[PDB]
């Protein structure tokens, strides 16, 4: 009978940076998916009120408009390889929308960052918030910058649509040999 707290995730006032995405577990609630890119994989969204899952994971972050296509199975790029990677067998939906009004200040919102450098690609659903200085040459950096692995987006309202901030919520639908706790209102 409990409603799933979708608005608590979507309508969160502050979203995390893509390198520090926030994951929340949704369980033991009825999932009304009726409380911009809306891509679903391995599932029909016209049957989302028509399905049951053991758990639903809700990840949230912020990227540019041009990086939204990278949030998908099998993608490649600085966001997909180094900041947020989906599994090739991902089951769930990816939702993004324009956020220039909320996350772009006139001088620039430098609180949002993305990972540019890493020594290995991100394994599915991995997260990395380290500040270790990336060594690009043959000489060890000894902890002194040798590039900082993070770069600020600098969101201003004057940027183009391909550089404006977008708020992304990645719903992951998961099944295991366990009772289903998240169901649409039509199978409550």
């Amino acid at each position: 009978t409990n409603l799933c707290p979708f608005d608590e995730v979507f309508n969160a006032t502050t979203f995390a940076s893509v390198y520090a995405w926030n994951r929340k577990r949704i369980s033991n609630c009825v999932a009304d998916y009726s409380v911009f890119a809306f891509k679903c994989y391995g599932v029909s969204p016209t049957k989302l009120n028509d399905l049951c899952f053991t758990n639903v994971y809700a990840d949230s972050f912020v990227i540019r408009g041009n990086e939204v296509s990278q949030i998908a199975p099998g993608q490649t790029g600085n966001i997909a390889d180094y900041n947020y990677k989906l599994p090739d067998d991902f089951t769930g939906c990816v939702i993004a929308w324009n956020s220039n009004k909320l996350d772009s200040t006139v001088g620039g919102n430098y609180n949002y960052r993305y990972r540019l450098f890493r020594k290995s690609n991100l394994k599915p659903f991995e997260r990395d918030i380290s500040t270790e200085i990336y060594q690009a040459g043959n000489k060890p950096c000894n902890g002194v910058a040798c590039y900082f692995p993070l770069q600020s987006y600098g969101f201003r309202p004057t940027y183009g649509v391909g550089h404006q901030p977008y708020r992304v919520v990645v719903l992951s639908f998961e099944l295991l040999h366990a009772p289903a706790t998240v169901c649409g209102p039509k199978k409550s």
Epitope: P5, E8, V9, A12, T13, T14, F15, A16, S17, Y19, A20, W21, N22, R23, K24, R25, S27, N28, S60, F61, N111, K119, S120, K123, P124, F125, E126, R127, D128, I129, S130, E132
Partner: antibody
């Protein structure tokens, strides 16, 4: 079996000194789990210290301990390490080695904790 | 920084139920985990993902999350439930990502 974390290497050290804590792990596949250290100053709450990836390729640190503490692991010998340098009087605490859940992302919650070793920094 | 606000101390009678709150900005947007630290003991996780108890934790321990307050409810309080209880969340905008609350000392009046 069952999970088991046994810390060692604590003691008393003067400020600006150095110390190395070791955590011996058993009851789980040490090579697959992310490891962390969480400390607790006496009569105070819990403060996250640092963490390490299953391979050691990724290390995270708290802002207070950045540039002074370095965390490493040896999956061959099933041991976690916390090398402490330039120790301050604020670093006095009981340091627990903790075990993450299986999978990613690492750092959500910590279901298994060690018994705890005490590090005291005093002039 | 994301700050989790916990009541410093809570006193309950044996057999009754105790409520320990955990406050934060949009705490419903984050998953809250609870830890129990008995005196002289290490922290032990009792609730994860705001509602679920790990194996071995009795059903008397319950979790909840709504709005800006997340509560941990212990029913039928026993003497062994006297401990320090900490709530924990994760934040990506804080530069300190692992957040532990101030903690609550649960005192049972046995």
């Amino acid at each position: 079996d069952e999970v088991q974390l046994v810390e060692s290497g604590g003691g008393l050290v003067q400020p600006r000194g150095s110390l190395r804590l070791s955590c011996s792990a058993s009851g789980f596949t040490f090579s697959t789990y992310a490891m962390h250290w969480v400390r607790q100053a006496p009569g105070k709450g819990l403060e996250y210290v640092s963490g390490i990836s299953v391979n050691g390729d990724s290390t995270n640190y708290a802002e207070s301990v950045k540039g002074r503490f370095t965390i490493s692991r040896d999956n061959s010998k099933n041991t976690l390490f916390l090398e402490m340098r330039s120790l301050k009087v604020e670093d006095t605490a009981v340091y627990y080695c903790v075990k993450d859940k299986m999978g990613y992302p690492t750092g959500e919650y910590f279901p298994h904790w060690g018994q705890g070793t005490l590090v005291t920094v005093s002039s | 920084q994301s700050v989790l606000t916990q009541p410093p101390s809570v006193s309950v009678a044996p057999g009754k139920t105790a409520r320990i709150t955990c406050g934060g900005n949009d705490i419903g947007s984050k998953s809250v985990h609870w830890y129990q630290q008995k005196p002289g003991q290490a922290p032990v996780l009792v609730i994860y993902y705001d509602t679920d108890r790990p194996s071995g934790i009795p059903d008397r321990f319950s979790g909840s999350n709504s709005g800006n307050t997340a509560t941990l409810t212990i029913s039928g309080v026993e003497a062994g439930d006297e401990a320090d209880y900490y709530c924990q969340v994760w934040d990506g905008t804080s530069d300190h990502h692992v957040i532990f609350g101030g903690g609550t000392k649960l005192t049972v009046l046995g």
